[PDB]
């Protein structure tokens, strides 16, 4: 919505206003969990195996992340967040004249390996890296020689000197002199000069001296990073400008696992080990924890931890966002092969709309062909992986779990229990010609069935969903706009189309058109309307009849 | 139901799913007695 | 300029259905795919060993459904024979213990005072002579002056001859420095010599050698005016020598002399390896559909199970067929069809004998069996199956009863029948099941049904691909998709790849970026059933 | 654990050496498990032909898919 072009004339001429708009939630899923790898208190988003397992290199955090994509194989593999809980530490160490630390975070950082090492040919010094636990390897050669210079006079005396600022030790001028004055003198105080590139060609407009941008890879420092060199026979031999320290960030720092800075003088050293790596241990207040998923877009988050605490303060955190006007919901899972009675005690303790509780516990076979025997909190990740997989308002009623073997096939005495009481629950259906494991109800902790909208997971995500996109339009549309007389006319046509579209997806089961009622008076608009919410089959009775009835030829 | 490719991919491509079942009670019979063979209780 | 063009189409003359082979050979490249299509290329590649008689064998498997572009690979690990001499570097282009015999040897001919090289290998009936070695051109002289010579040296920092010098007594007459110029070949340095008033340099008679300029060897003093004196350069003669005709490569790595009539070394096989999961890696994207390892292994089966897996799962589906064992119980072949039990691997239990074209009644395990049917079948159309089609084998080690062979194929297990006195042979197959035992799914439990499906989703993926992602969405868009699915339908049935499809089902909707499409078909089948009733009737 | 987990990847990285030679037993299909494998003691490799025994993963294995019988390990 500009003009073209976007520079208003006067003159005669012809312009053109093109709008380019009119021809264009998610539901993320959080995970929090376990890994040897990645910062601490920090989010990472998530959308490929490899591209977890670069970064979440192995631990129960990995699988968790496999389960969640793997929950729903006939849907996409949808976004989700990741983060660590250890107060992991990198590796460093500090050897020569330079800091070395790596970028991983934890015990693993420490088998990386960095040496320098020097090169007699090009007499420039030499990087290499290793690490022994991928097989990785890289080498940053010819370190130094940013550019030469070269001396054609023929008087005795031909040299150059890098003086340094004295306060900050920068280099300030770059100097050249002949027999024992300065012919020219580089004083670094401003101009083009502050890149070498221009004091280069300025060195190559001289009548004797002369510089050659360096052939081996071009570096094009800043001419205060530069090194320092004196009583250099310039004339008899070409001298290296060489600035080590420069080359530190050329090379080094925007590539490779290793960071390096300086404290000392570079040297070469051998190939040495980094130490200092420390995975950590989880902190005792996971409020800081989830404090970084505050304005992250999930919907969804699950810990992969069975205490009671840690449930509490994310069931506090979750119901805080709520009231924040970002709401969102949590699903947890009790230990091995607990008890009904547990199973109990947890749901009383938590007691919350927003959260759900997952009993059955059992194996998932791994893509990589483990039978790995998980809790319940892992199931608890499978179930949320398959909420999010499904559209905005859809329940996870009798939908197949896709789980390999469970620890506790239940009858109906079991089920019947733990869905009163507000559990989740899963059985392996047997009545038939082929067998499969079942959700058999979506029920949250809320043990009171009279409001459907707490009670239900499917109806409360539609209700959150129709909310906070409603709002989040309202304010990006109209706020801020003219109170014009046809005003409340758009606004109801507006929401018309809202949820017109609303229901042409299937969120919601129908409304009055015309209780879509707006009334403007001064800066406040006021708005009622009806909806009437989608609901999920759940009971189903057929009242069948028999009769007799003659026939006759 | 498998979409081809089993993995959606986001470039430019052509996804074919297929309902691998389409080109497809018993009233079982059951006995219960002596043998000399097989386990006790399976 | 005005000028006339002409243009020709091929597209309407005309998947194919290739066939693969992976196992032991005793000849050619290590890691190496190759496309294969006669059998004197084949030959020539792989020199000998099971994987030549497994070509054959399905290239001569049906009399009439012989499959084609069958490719094939060398699993052993084998490295080349190689020997050195003074400064030379003598390798062999085969791989294995094949290239030691090759013999080779360098001599001197006294007549011409060159160099003679002699390679012979017995096994193929080879026998040649490089005579000529070097002797690149002669220098002579015509003059009546005191004395008459030349001198070309080498420059040490790159071993290049740095000049080339003609000199009457001690002055020289002109110069040639071969480290510059334009004289970088000996022709364009005999081309100005020949010009000099009182001298020459003519390219000896032994054919055109036309060798680099920098690569002559060091001759100083050498009188002109008595002799033609013969500049050499045997190493890079060599090259000349050794251009088209050879089987053994030289290299230098110095001088060269002459040698005994040497025979090579460090030609190793090597043993086979355990697994072939690196092996396997190199067919991801050959094209094949058809692949049999020639290996009894059961590790090996499970590797060649998951590969296929992984190929279908990345958008190239791939069956493979497998057997092994001579003469092994139904016990066996149970549990082998147990550990499997995968819909797109098949299990082969006859073992036989087959005669080849050149007169072995070999006797082979299973899997050669396998091989020949998965040659079969890919030589049969797509959706077409392999019931109750000839084979041709001469004999097996058993002939299973009519009870024998219900139990392998309620086992999911292929098997063959002996039958007596058939127009073409005395054998056939009994069923094309695959080890997945689910007799009520179709597309799982037999084999042509699954690849009819798996060729009818490929095709109309790569077609759709090609045609219609990356160009315009118009208004006539929608309708030409129609119609090129359509016409494609039509062609299939044409074809008889299908049985029927409604083309009233047939659906487009476009909008912005995507293209929502619906159809449906009616699948091939080929009869296993055939019943026939009978009814009598009289007039009185 | 890892790649080792069976004795296919122990045979191959021993062939990997140029001065060893480990073929394979030729007798059917083996392939046991690495952690079944019977102690050895400082064996001479280079006057003999070292062979691995593993006897009850090998009982195990060719009496696995043949017979009635099975048999355990006191």
Redesign the interface.
């Known amino acids: 919505v500009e003009p073209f072009p976007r520079r208003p004339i006067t003159r005669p001429h012809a312009s053109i206003e093109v709008d380019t708009s009119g ?1 264009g939630s998610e539901k993320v899923f959080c995970l929090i969990g376990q890994a040897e790898g990645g910062e601490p208190n920090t989010v990472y988003e998530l959308r490929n195996y490899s591209q977890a397992k670069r970064l979440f290199r192995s631990g129960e955090l990995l699988d968790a992340i496999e389960l969640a994509w793997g929950s729903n ?2 849907y ?2 949808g976004r989700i967040l990741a983060m660590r809980i250890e107060d992991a530490k990198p590796a460093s160490a500090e050897i020569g004249g330079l800091k070395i630390t790596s970028k991983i975070y934890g015990n693993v950082a420490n088998n990386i390996q960095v040496g320098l090492e020097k090169n007699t040919l090009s007499d420039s010094l030499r990087l290499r890296v290793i690490f022994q636990d991928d097989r990785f390897n890289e080498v940053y050669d010819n370190i130094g020689n940013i550019f030469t210079i070269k001396y054609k006079g023929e008087e005795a005396n031909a040299t150059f000197s890098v003086e340094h600022d004295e306060e900050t030790q920068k280099a300030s001028r770059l100097v050249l002199k002949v027999g024992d004055q300065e012919v020219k003198s580089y004083d670094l105080t401003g101009g083009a000069y502050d890149y070498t590139n221009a004091i280069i060609t300025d060195i190559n407009q001289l009548p004797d001296f002369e510089a050659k941008l360096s052939p081996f890879g071009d570096k094009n420092l800043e001419s205060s990073k530069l090194d320092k060199i004196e009583n250099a026979n310039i004339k008899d031999k070409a001298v290296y400008v060489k600035a080590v320290f420069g080359d530190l960030e050329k090379q080094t720092a925007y590539n490779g696992i290793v960071s390096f800075e300086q404290l000392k003088t570079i040297e070469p050293f051998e190939l040495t080990k980094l130490k200092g790596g420390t995975n950590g241990e989880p902190p005792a207040t996971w409020a800081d924890k989830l404090d970084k998923f505050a304005h992250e877009g999930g919907y969804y988050i699950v810990p992969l931890s069975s205490k009671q605490s840690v449930h509490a303060e994310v069931a506090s955190f979750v119901k805080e966002r709520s009231d924040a006007g970002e709401p969102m919901r949590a699903i947890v899972g009790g230990g091995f092969n607990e008890s009904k009675e547990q199973l109990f005690g947890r749901q009383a303790s938590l007691s919350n709309p927003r959260v759900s509780l997952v009993a059955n516990s059992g194996t998932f076979v791994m893509d990589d062909g483990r039978k790995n025997h998980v809790p319940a909190y892992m199931v608890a990740v499978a179930l949320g992986g398959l909420a999010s997989g499904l559209e905005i308002g859809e329940s996870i009623t009798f939908k197949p779990l896709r789980v390999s073997s469970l620890d506790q096939i239940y009858e109906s005495i079991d089920l019947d229990e733990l869905n009163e009481n507000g559990i989740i629950s899963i059985e392996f259906v047997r009545n038939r ?1 082929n067998t499969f494991f079942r959700i058999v109800d979506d029920v949250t902790t809320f043990n009171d069935k009279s409001d459907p909208v707490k009670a239900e997971m499917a109806v409360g995500e539609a209700n959150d969903f129709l909310v906070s996109e409603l709002k989040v339009q309202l304010e990006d549309q109209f706020i801020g706009t003219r109170t014009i007389n046809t005003s409340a006319s758009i606004i109801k046509d507006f929401i018309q189309s809202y949820l017109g579209r609303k229901k042409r997806d299937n969120e919601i089961q129908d409304f009055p058109a015309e209780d879509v009622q707006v009334i403007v008076e001064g800066n406040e608009a006021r708005i009622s309307m009806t909806v009437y919410p989608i609901r999920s089959f759940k009971k189903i009775s057929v009242s069948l009849v028999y009769k007799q009835q003659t026939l006759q030829a």
Request: net charge neutral; charged share 0%.
């Open positions: 021809i194989p006939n996409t593999a010609t």
